[PDB]
C-alpha cells in the first residue's frame, strides 16, 4: 500500500551521462554506442547551420567521468547535435528513442556537468511543457521510461520558459510544442487538466482505501464531458474508458461511476478532506503508473 | 526553477540488490562486500534465535541477477540477517550505515525479487513510520542518501502497519520506533507535522516566485511555538532557526518573519491559493533538500 510519485531506477541512464563543453558553455550529453547527443545550443556564444560549419571536432570537449572522449565527427539533427566519438560506451543499455504524447509520464535524471544529481517523475502537459526542476547547467538532461531491460528515451531538456516551466525535444531533436532553442518571447499556452489521469489516481485512491468521494451515481460520457469542458479538463474518450478497464475491474467501480465522483469533486470541492494525502486532484499519474505501483512490476 | 520530490540517483544501490529465498519466502537483500543483509523474518514460516539455530547455509538461496551466490556463513544482528557469501560484490560503492532522525528524508529503492522497480523520496515521520509505497515482496528494500560518492544507508523495509504506513530498521537491524518484526496489534502512534521542513518548503516557494503568503510581520519564537502546539506542529528550536540561515539569507526573509507567514496560513488557510502546486503545507522537504535543489549539487 501507499502511493508515491515514483521514478524508474536511474542506473542505466547514469552510465550514459557525459559532460559536453564548447567554448565557455558546458552542458550534459547522452553517450550511447559511439555517439554523444546534446542540445545544439552548446555551440552558441542565430543561424545554427552557419554556427556549426564554423566548428571543428576539437572544439567539443567530451568528458565521461575521468575519461576524455575524442570527437571524430559531428552533425546536427534538428535541435540536437550528434558527436561521433572514437569509443562506444560499454555501459550502453538496450534503448529506443520514442516520442511521447501529452498526458504521458516519464522519469527525469537531472544532471549538472555530466554528473547525475537527482531523479523525479513528471508528465508532458497538454500544452507541451513539463513542470520540471532544473537549474543552470541542466540542459541535456534526459527523460525516459524503462520496460524490462529497455530504456525508452523520450525527452532532452533545452529551455526554461518565463513561467518557470520547461521545454525540450525528443531524442531526434524535434521540440515538443511550439518552442524554439532561441531567444524569443515564447511562452507556454493555456494548459488543461489530464482527465484520464485524474480518474486513474482516483482508482489508486480506492485501491489504497480512500473511498469517501464515491457515490451510487453513474453519469454518461457526454454528460461528464460537458462538465469537463466547464472546468478546463480534457475530454474523456471511449479509448480512455477502455484503458481504465483493468482498474475498474480490480475495484469493481465502473469508469462512468467514477466519473460521477469526479463531477461531484469538481462542483463541490473536497470539504476539507484529502485523497492520497493531496487536497487537489492529481493528474500526473497515468493508468499504467497506477497499475505498475498497485501491482509491483520491476 | 521548479521544485519536485527528487530522489538520489539509484544506480549505486541497484548494483547491490539481490534476491534472498528461504523456504517459500522470497524477499530482497543488500549485497555489500561479501555480506548480504536482509530482514530476519525471511526465516519464518516466534523465537528467532531458535529459528536460526535450526537453519543451515544451504537453506538460503541468494541470487544476484543470473548468478547464484554461495552462502558460507550466517548470523543474526538484531532484526537483520547477515549472510556471508563467497564473493565480494564488485559493484560495492563507498558506503556507510547511518541512522536518521525523525524529520529527515531519504530515497527508497523499491524492489521485488531482487529487481529494482522504482525510486522515490520520503521522510521519517515524528512517529517513526514512513509513508512509503510497498507491495508484497518489497521487504528488504532499502533507503539511502548519497553524498559525493558515498551511499549512506539508513533504512531497510520490514513491515506494513494497519493504517498502510511502513516500519523498518536501520542497517544494524534496530527498528525505528516501537515496532517489531512479529504479529502483534502494533499501530502507529499519533503523528505531528515537521515544522522546520514546512518553513524550508516556504523558502523554496519564495525562491521559485510564490510570495503571496508573505507579510510584513515578525513573531517571536515563543509566540510561534504556542501556535505550533495548537496545530499539532513540532516545536521550533533555535537550532532550527540556525539551520534555516542559508535560506533566510538567500531570500532576505528572516526565519521569524517566515514564521509569521506560517502562523497566518495555519489560522486562515490558503483561501483557494496554492504554494508550489500544493493546497496543503508540505513537510517532507528538509532545509538541505531545498538548498540541494535550489542550488544544484550533484
Residue numbers in the entry:
A (entry chain A), B (entry chain A): 1 to 45, 52 to 304
Give me lines lifted from the publication on this model.
Inhibiting the catalytic activity of 3CLpro has been proven to be an effective strategy to block coronavirus replication. In this study, we have identified mutations in SARS-CoV-2 3CLpro that confer resistance to WU-04.
Two strains carried double nucleotide mutations T10200A (3CLpro: M49K) and A10547G (3CLpro: M165V) in the viral genomes, whereas the other two strains carried double mutations T10200A (3CLpro: M49K) and T10955C (3CLpro: S301P). These structures demonstrate that the M49K mutation disturbs the local structure around the substrate-binding pocket of 3CLpro, but the M165V mutation does not induce conformational changes. The double mutants M49K/M165V and M49K/S301P exhibited stronger resistance to ensitrelvir as compared to these single mutants: the IC50 values are 10.2 and 7.8 times that against the WT 3CLpro, respectively.
